Amino acid sequence: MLSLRPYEFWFVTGSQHLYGEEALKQVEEHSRIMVNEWNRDSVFPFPFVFKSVVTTPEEIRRVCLEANASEQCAGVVTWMHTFSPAKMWIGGLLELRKPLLHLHTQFNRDIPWDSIDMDFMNLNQSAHGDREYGFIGARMGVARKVVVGHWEDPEVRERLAKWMRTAVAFAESRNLKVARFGDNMREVAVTEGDKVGAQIQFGWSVNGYGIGDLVQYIRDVSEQKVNELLDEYEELYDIVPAGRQEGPVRESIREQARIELGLKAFLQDGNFTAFTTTFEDLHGMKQLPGLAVQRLMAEGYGFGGEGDWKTAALVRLMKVMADGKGTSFMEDYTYHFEPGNELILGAHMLEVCPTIAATRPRVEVHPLSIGGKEDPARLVFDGGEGAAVNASLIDLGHRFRLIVNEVDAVKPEHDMPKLPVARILWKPRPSLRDSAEAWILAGGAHHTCFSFAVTTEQLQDFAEMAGIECVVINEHTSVSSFKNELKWNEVFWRG
Amino acid sequence: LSLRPYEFWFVTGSQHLYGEEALKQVEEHSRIMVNEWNRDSVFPFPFVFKSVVTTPEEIRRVCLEANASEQCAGVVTWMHTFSPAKMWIGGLLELRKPLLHLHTQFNRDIPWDSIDMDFMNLNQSAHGDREYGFIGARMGVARKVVVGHWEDPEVRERLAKWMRTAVAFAESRNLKVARFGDNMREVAVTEGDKVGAQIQFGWSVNGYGIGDLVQYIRDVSEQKVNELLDEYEELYDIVPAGRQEGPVRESIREQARIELGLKAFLQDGNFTAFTTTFEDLHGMKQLPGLAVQRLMAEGYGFGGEGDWKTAALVRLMKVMADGKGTSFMEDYTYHFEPGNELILGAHMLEVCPTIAATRPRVEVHPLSIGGKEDPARLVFDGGEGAAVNASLIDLGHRFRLIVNEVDAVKPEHDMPKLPVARILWKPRPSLRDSAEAWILAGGAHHTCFSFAVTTEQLQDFAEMAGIECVVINEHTSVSSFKNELKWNEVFWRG
Amino acid sequence: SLRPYEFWFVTGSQHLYGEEALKQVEEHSRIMVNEWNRDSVFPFPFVFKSVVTTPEEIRRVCLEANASEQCAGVVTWMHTFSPAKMWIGGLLELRKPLLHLHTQFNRDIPWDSIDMDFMNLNQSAHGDREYGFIGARMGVARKVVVGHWEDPEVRERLAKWMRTAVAFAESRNLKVARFGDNMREVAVTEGDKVGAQIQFGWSVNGYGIGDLVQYIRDVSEQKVNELLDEYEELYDIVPAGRQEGPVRESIREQARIELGLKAFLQDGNFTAFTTTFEDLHGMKQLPGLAVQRLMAEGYGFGGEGDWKTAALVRLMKVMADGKGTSFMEDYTYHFEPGNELILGAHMLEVCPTIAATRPRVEVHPLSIGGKEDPARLVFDGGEGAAVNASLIDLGHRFRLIVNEVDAVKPEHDMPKLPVARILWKPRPSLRDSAEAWILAGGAHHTCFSFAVTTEQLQDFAEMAGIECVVINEHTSVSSFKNELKWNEVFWRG
């Protein structure tokens, strides 16, 4: 499983000098108390770090600068404990490139009726401090998340926690290194795009390597590690009978083990956390990578087929973002149009991640004429069931668009014994008919990232951080409204 | 404060085509409508019959005349018959007075057994007002549209509300604001472009040294100070100590002196709104407290710490208000108790007693902010009921009006230690959602709170003035409001 | 009064050619920095930064540049091909002024020996073009300079740019104290301080005149007396000013004002300020002599609450090489055919650094403001090529307007004129400059300077992201009108 560096979140509290140093002592006490308490709550997947109360232009600017330079700082949560005149914040906000969350909160929950006096009013006035702050944010057009509520409210904490995962995905995005073995599948439009534009927009480093580079790593893999990995297959998966005995079928599987170790070595050496292949460029390869790619995805690598670096990037980010397991490369393959039981069968010619499997994966070998190589080994299974998202990040030329459809994956009511690939069935919201229409209106790709764990809110928060359109298709979606929103979003996102 | 008499010009459109006799009937109808409208006490200002126009010369002239007439607060136009709209272009180009298109009809019902060609030629607002509607759209003219029979009570109430709004707009274009001192240092939301605002709303905003006001206070007759103090004891409950010749009374007397110096200065230069700033009180004995509260009660606009936008907004809203209860206001602290979320609003001193549920109480207490003597002020609880809380901000290249609908509630508990007037309110549709939407819109901490101004009125003002207005209320969804802000921004740039 | 600002020389290369080649790259860049730092044309020093060749190295040095208060600018050069996607991360991060120097270590092609190793080494010819693309592609604010690194003209362009960049550093940290508001009803000096703070860095805040009165009250009389003595050393005095009597006491009061202002300004780190004759409660005189001396010291000043000009006067003073920079206001014209000119002055506040003659301390009545007869330096402004500049607020954005002028020595004395003044012939003529200036909405308040060039002001605008328009010898009014229009749509948003 791919490891993230330790990330943390900086809690920055604004006030001013006007009220006195004692008032400021109490502001610092309050913010230290909230940071300690939050960090005792297991709801948070990363820790908060307390930062000295900021009360001057230079205190604010310096902590924003420090937030930029710290590789461990994944995000900044800002809260005005008192009025904190926002011209002081301009400098800081200009320097800050780290994800920004404005928490509009209050130390105490209730008003202490019998004792509330003027010092109290001078102290617990987020009711207006955050609004003066809220204005400079709006006036400057800063990318921000706004969260309102009491700091002990578990619902407030839950959305801070989701946001943390999202911001951490953003940090990984900023440092993402993608390796392509070969180019886009020829004549294909949706997988194409502008890598320079994407690096500017998201930070992704996307670069191409000849398949020959990978072949060399596969050749240097030790035969004993191949054997140990093959043993490891026999314990995690069901192997087709023919593959449990010496011969051609077992060899195919051993060859996917060799491909896995080769990919791992190439990837780790370059610090890549996502990659692409293309069946159209497989010189020196025995097989299209299949089982091998499925296993790497289960370890958390991003992947896109046919040189699809956008989806490969998205799969990795969404894996980072996910608060659970079950995130895979995905493609819509065929439809079931039965009235009252409309669903979508999703798969890829080989590469579906076992993390979405309901059942225990079977290693199988089957012919594949696409790519013209030997019968590839792959994991075969039925995807699980439950609420999910299926998302696509496309390139409209001048800008990017992130498109997400909320879906309900369903348990197959029938076996599919002649079907050589892993697969999943889902019912897209609000209906097959409407969702597919809205998707085509938005020009969503056929390649997506499917996840049982990423929420719609996370993807939108990510889109906000990155400065891109995010369009969502779910229960409440009307096709005609959706159509208008694309037009209205159009004009707004130009520039 | 008192308004000059304002009136509303009813202009009726028709054409020569159907003959002179037809035109006499059109005129007879409009005279009947105006005379009967004026008998209806729902209208706060009179209508004036301003002829039936049928030529571009007649239309242009009435529009010129309307601009030049200080009495004329608005023009109501109605096409009784087809009145070809190229004739109206020149007039609509000239017109700078607020415009209401009344889409109406003289008879309520179709007289089935008698309706004939003369009748069809005569009562054809059905298409008259549409052709006129095209030219208004085509020209991007600022306007209010109202549809309905002229005797319908709902039509008349919409008309009545718009009148108040048009009148405030007239006061807007003549507003004088006096600033005693500059903005509070380092504050962003109260800053903004005065030249832009003068162009956009008509507001004159100019700064005076606090010294100029001190001079006026210094020249206040002590005989008048004493009589004003009598009125306080007559109107308010004084703290027991303030009723005997001690130092508590002297503090109340100083506020009285400040009230009179403020009035003298403000009337001298015809100001109807003003700001102070606690960062500049040289030559002053107290931060203007009680005094400001009174001037607000008389309909003055006021803004704390140099806030001229809110000061203006408060005067404008007092003018368009159909009732009592409009104040400068600032959200101070939250009550986050699940199921009873509310906001406590107040200022450090300046809250208008016109929103008070209880008889105001003159108290004196220390206030460290400003470094001056303990100020006298009126203390009370805010009343209950539906209200709006509004803010107007400067985004740099344009202005944005933000209004939250709220429900003010009676406090369930006394606040003994609290030395300022206050009010509690629950924001729609929830405290969490309104605060989020408000922050998304960049709404100020300083607002104008009122029990008597409606969202329709504020929206109509924004229309009259060519600025965005966004409303947060029961039906507001936050994610929709984010989009509404995005899409509006693209429309309003340029 | 400045500080040790410095400029970071960042050199790009790549791992492609091996380590030896990279060592040579590094050795060239250290030499270049050493040699530049041994050339007096440069008003500030360069700093060597180790040759960057990876995305993390580039991003790191940009993060560092941003955090360093002494770093006034980054100078980037691609010694070899240095694949520009590596530079995207750092360029997004960098908020310091950026100059792209397009140069080459060796001046000539060594014909008889040039081989593949030399072609891989000295390939700025294409390294800087690839870097040029990413800059244009991302829309970064930048200055481009082309030529050999030992070419004296390249060095002068680099040096001029250094002063501009330092002005911009000062701008990002500038504080303006306003004693009182804008002169009532005036439009051009109004504006949006929040927008100015976002765009330029300027902090502009208001103090009651009372706060300055208090500082003036707190000044010790020994220092007043010392200062009064300095006036006697530096200026000619009205004879009546030499001995005791009310004229002497008028001058004494300006010293007292100057020392009050100085202490207020130093306590708060204000390097520019404004006053308004419309608010002088507690003062005895409108600040006059006092203001002129503070401008001579390097402070920005603006009359009638004019912060934008106050800031501009300070900024231009910083970027200037030499004395002769002042707050200024067009006062009256000489329309004599063939000898058309403008008399610029202010009611008291003209800076003595533009003086041709020794300033004289004089006391004259002044009814504007309703206070006592103010003491001021009086003199005739010098002659020579200069610029007159205004910064205005169009509502949605700021516009810098610059007229190149030729200051001239007055042919006649002006015995009855109680203020310091200066005469000038604006280019390309009074008729044309005045018209273009009005078409552009130029303020009447300006910063006048003998020492600032047009290119500098254009480079500052470039750094700050605002329009700059120039009126000079080549200006056609009708082309200028078009330019305003075409610039208009470019700058919107």
Side-chain angles (χ1 to χ4, degrees), chain C residues 150-349:
Chain C
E150 286 179 307
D151 187 333
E153 262 163 26
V154 171
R155 304 196 164 175
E156 303 271 5
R157 280 228 270 157
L158 286 179
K160 275 263 130 80
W161 181 81
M162 283 184 176
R163 298 183 196 275
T164 305
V166 165
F168 186 75
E170 281 292 279
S171 166
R172 286 277 192 65
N173 302 283
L174 187 98
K175 298 179 61 192
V176 171
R178 296 172 82 221
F179 303 105
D181 218 333
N182 294 78
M183 176 180 170
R184 298 189 278 282
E185 313 264 38
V186 181
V188 76
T189 66
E190 194 45 84
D192 169 29
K193 300 174 188 67
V194 163
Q197 187 148 355
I198 289 149
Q199 202 78 56
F200 302 121
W202 310 344
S203 187
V204 177
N205 299 283
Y207 297 84
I209 179 66
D211 297 18
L212 172 77
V213 167
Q214 186 65 48
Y215 267 72
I216 287 169
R217 198 91 354 190
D218 286 342
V219 171
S220 85
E221 298 278 17
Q222 183 181 234
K223 285 159 188 171
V224 177
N225 295 338
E226 258 141 88
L227 184 47
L228 184 44
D229 287 337
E230 294 192 32
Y231 294 177
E232 278 162 18
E233 313 288 319
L234 279 151
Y235 318 119
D236 296 333
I237 315 284
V238 281
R242 247 88 70 119
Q243 70 252 22
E244 201 48 62
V247 170
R248 168 87 167 181
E249 204 66 15
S250 287
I251 305 168
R252 171 175 281 109
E253 193 64 22
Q254 284 293 329
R256 187 174 282 115
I257 289 161
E258 173 188 340
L259 292 170
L261 274 170
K262 240 208 186 62
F264 186 95
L265 297 162
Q266 286 166 339
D267 282 5
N269 185 45
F270 307 101
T271 56
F273 70 100
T274 71
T275 57
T276 164
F277 69 80
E278 284 188 342
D279 195 7
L280 296 172
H281 291 299
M283 305 287 292
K284 292 163 78 72
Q285 297 177 20
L286 167 69
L289 204 181
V291 169
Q292 300 176 271
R293 288 199 85 241
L294 290 156
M295 270 189 297
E297 202 170 320
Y299 282 92
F301 168 75
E304 292 75 71
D306 185 1
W307 46 279
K308 302 190 303 288
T309 311
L312 186 61
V313 170
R314 167 62 189 163
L315 267 34
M316 284 179 58
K317 182 63 195 42
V318 177
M319 71 185 77
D321 64 341
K323 87 163 178 175
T325 297
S326 180
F327 175 65
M328 187 54 61
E329 175 170 4
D330 310 68
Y331 243 96
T332 198
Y333 289 154
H334 190 70
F335 276 121
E336 171 188 29
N339 188 32
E340 292 99 352
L341 50 98
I342 306 173
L343 189 152
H346 199 252
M347 65 190 168
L348 297 176
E349 316 86 324

Side-chain angles (χ1 to χ4, degrees), chain B residues 38-342:
Chain B
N38 285 341
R39 300 175 54 75
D40 193 323
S41 59
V42 73
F43 302 105
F45 302 92
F47 284 101
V48 174
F49 171 84
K50 274 298 177 180
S51 91
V52 179
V53 290
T54 63
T55 66
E57 294 69 30
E58 292 168 351
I59 294 167
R60 169 150 193 272
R61 184 175 64 246
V62 79
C63 298
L64 256 358
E65 283 167 4
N67 289 342
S69 157
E70 295 303 303
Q71 199 111 324
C72 172
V75 177
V76 179
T77 58
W78 172 54
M79 313 299 117
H80 192 319
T81 87
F82 202 57
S83 185
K86 285 202 295 174
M87 301 191 307
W88 286 82
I89 295 176
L92 294 173
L93 283 180
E94 292 297 329
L95 191 62
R96 301 198 78 248
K97 290 305 173 53
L99 171 71
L100 191 144
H101 179 196
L102 173 56
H103 178 33
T104 190
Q105 182 175 269
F106 179 78
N107 58 291
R108 190 189 85 180
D109 291 349
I110 295 191
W112 306 106
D113 34 320
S114 85
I115 174 156
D116 62 348
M117 206 56 169
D118 284 336
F119 187 97
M120 295 273 285
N121 299 337
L122 178 54
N123 306 294
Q124 49 171 226
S125 285
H127 64 255
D129 288 317
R130 287 171 204 248
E131 150 82 342
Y132 181 62
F134 167 76
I135 202 55
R138 174 58 163 96
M139 282 175 61
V141 157
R143 68 182 163 167
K144 168 89 165 183
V145 185
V146 174
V147 184
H149 188 252
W150 71 281
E151 296 191 278
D152 188 318
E154 188 261 336
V155 180
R156 296 190 181 182
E157 285 152 23
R158 261 167 75 114
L159 287 171
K161 283 289 190 207
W162 183 83
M163 284 188 175
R164 301 179 186 281
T165 311
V167 168
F169 185 74
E171 293 292 305
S172 182
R173 302 225 276 215
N174 285 295
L175 195 66
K176 287 201 71 180
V177 182
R179 294 174 84 221
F180 305 111
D182 213 347
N183 295 78
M184 182 181 162
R185 290 187 285 277
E186 309 273 37
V187 181
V189 72
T190 64
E191 196 42 83
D193 176 35
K194 293 183 197 63
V195 169
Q198 184 147 9
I199 295 166
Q200 197 71 36
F201 311 109
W203 307 343
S204 199
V205 180
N206 296 281
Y208 296 89
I210 186 67
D212 294 343
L213 165 65
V214 165
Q215 182 52 240
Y216 268 82
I217 290 178
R218 174 183 166 92
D219 285 342
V220 163
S221 152
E222 189 75 37
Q223 159 81 283
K224 293 202 190 305
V225 179
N226 295 335
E227 305 176 51
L228 178 51
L229 196 60
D230 285 336
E231 200 173 325
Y232 288 178
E233 171 74 306
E234 175 179 329
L235 281 172
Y236 317 119
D237 291 340
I238 317 286
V239 288
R243 294 178 270 178
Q244 307 166 358
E245 204 76 359
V248 169
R249 186 164 195 88
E250 280 312 291
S251 302
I252 309 183
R253 139 172 289 107
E254 191 55 42
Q255 278 297 324
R257 201 181 324 275
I258 293 161
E259 167 172 348
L260 294 171
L262 277 170
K263 285 181 75 92
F265 175 90
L266 298 162
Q267 294 167 5
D268 216 293
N270 300 294
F271 303 96
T272 40
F274 69 100
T275 71
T276 64
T277 160
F278 65 75
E279 290 182 325
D280 182 24
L281 300 162
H282 292 279
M284 296 281 300
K285 264 168 157 292
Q286 312 181 357
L287 181 66
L290 192 165
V292 175
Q293 292 178 290
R294 298 207 81 236
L295 297 195
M296 276 195 294
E298 302 180 29
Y300 280 80
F302 173 77
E305 54 254 25
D307 190 352
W308 54 271
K309 280 185 265 82
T310 309
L313 183 57
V314 164
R315 170 64 190 155
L316 295 182
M317 286 184 64
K318 216 94 162 201
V319 178
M320 63 170 92
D322 84 319
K324 146 198 191 285
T326 293
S327 170
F328 173 67
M329 181 61 55
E330 176 173 8
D331 319 74
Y332 242 91
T333 201
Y334 293 160
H335 188 77
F336 264 123
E337 178 203 358
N340 187 37
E341 289 100 336
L342 50 87

Side-chain angles (χ1 to χ4, degrees), chain A residues 386-390 405-409 426-429 435 450-451 473:
Chain A
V389 302
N390 203 34
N405 179 209
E406 298 193 61
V407 306
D408 292 283
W426 71 80
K427 300 196 195 284
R429 304 181 188 166
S435 90
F450 182 104
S451 184
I473 303 168

Side-chain angles (χ1 to χ4, degrees), chain A residues 57 67 81 96 118 138 161 182-183 193 217 225 248 252 254 260 266 273 282 305 352 422 462:
Chain A
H81 191 319
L96 198 59
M118 197 64 193
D183 216 344
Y217 270 87
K225 303 278 184 149
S252 305
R254 159 154 32 250
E260 188 188 326
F266 178 93
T273 55
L282 296 169
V352 184
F462 182 94

Side-chain angles (χ1 to χ4, degrees), chain A residues 73-334:
Chain A
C73 178
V76 170
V77 175
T78 55
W79 172 49
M80 311 302 123
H81 191 319
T82 86
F83 198 62
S84 184
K87 283 160 36 155
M88 301 192 315
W89 286 80
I90 282 162
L93 289 175
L94 288 176
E95 309 280 350
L96 198 59
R97 296 200 86 247
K98 292 297 167 69
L100 178 67
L101 189 149
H102 182 200
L103 178 63
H104 183 32
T105 196
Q106 191 173 262
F107 182 68
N108 63 304
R109 201 191 75 188
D110 300 344
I111 293 178
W113 303 107
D114 56 24
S115 78
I116 184 180
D117 57 353
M118 197 64 193
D119 290 331
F120 184 90
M121 298 262 284
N122 286 344
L123 184 58
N124 301 118
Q125 47 175 227
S126 285
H128 64 256
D130 287 323
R131 304 185 185 240
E132 151 80 345
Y133 183 67
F135 166 77
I136 198 63
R139 171 74 171 82
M140 291 169 66
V142 319
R144 57 175 176 180
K145 166 74 154 188
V146 175
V147 171
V148 180
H150 186 254
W151 69 277
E152 293 189 293
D153 183 343
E155 180 266 323
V156 171
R157 290 178 177 196
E158 267 152 16
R159 71 184 58 260
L160 293 170
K162 285 297 183 207
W163 182 84
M164 286 188 163
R165 302 185 189 270
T166 305
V168 162
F170 197 66
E172 294 295 305
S173 187
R174 282 279 182 65
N175 295 287
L176 185 66
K177 290 196 61 194
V178 179
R180 302 164 84 224
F181 307 104
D183 216 344
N184 297 74
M185 177 180 171
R186 304 191 277 276
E187 312 263 45
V188 172
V190 76
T191 63
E192 203 39 278
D194 176 27
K195 298 181 193 62
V196 174
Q199 187 147 8
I200 287 165
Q201 201 66 29
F202 314 107
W204 306 343
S205 171
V206 182
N207 298 280
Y209 294 83
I211 186 60
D213 284 11
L214 180 50
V215 167
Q216 183 59 51
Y217 270 87
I218 294 161
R219 198 231 285 188
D220 299 330
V221 171
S222 98
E223 198 55 44
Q224 195 57 35
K225 303 278 184 149
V226 183
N227 293 333
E228 295 171 16
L229 180 52
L230 195 49
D231 292 335
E232 187 190 332
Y233 289 167
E234 317 227 23
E235 324 211 41
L236 291 154
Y237 315 130
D238 289 330
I239 316 279
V240 279
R244 308 185 76 219
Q245 170 197 337
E246 277 303 338
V249 173
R250 186 167 186 81
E251 277 320 304
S252 305
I253 305 182
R254 159 154 32 250
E255 187 55 37
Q256 282 291 327
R258 202 183 305 274
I259 290 172
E260 188 188 326
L261 296 174
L263 278 160
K264 252 211 185 78
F266 178 93
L267 270 12
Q268 292 169 8
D269 180 57
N271 277 98
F272 302 100
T273 55
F275 69 102
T276 78
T277 64
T278 172
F279 70 76
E280 275 173 349
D281 191 10
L282 296 169
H283 297 280
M285 301 294 282
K286 297 279 215 167
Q287 303 171 21
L288 182 66
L291 205 182
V293 169
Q294 298 177 288
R295 304 244 317 145
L296 289 187
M297 269 193 291
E299 296 190 18
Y301 282 91
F303 168 82
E306 293 106 76
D308 188 2
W309 52 273
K310 289 192 303 307
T311 315
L314 186 62
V315 169
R316 171 61 188 161
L317 305 186
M318 281 178 64
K319 157 62 39 47
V320 173
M321 211 175 298
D323 87 320
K325 58 159 282 171
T327 296
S328 176
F329 183 57
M330 189 57 60
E331 177 174 10
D332 312 65
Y333 242 91
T334 203

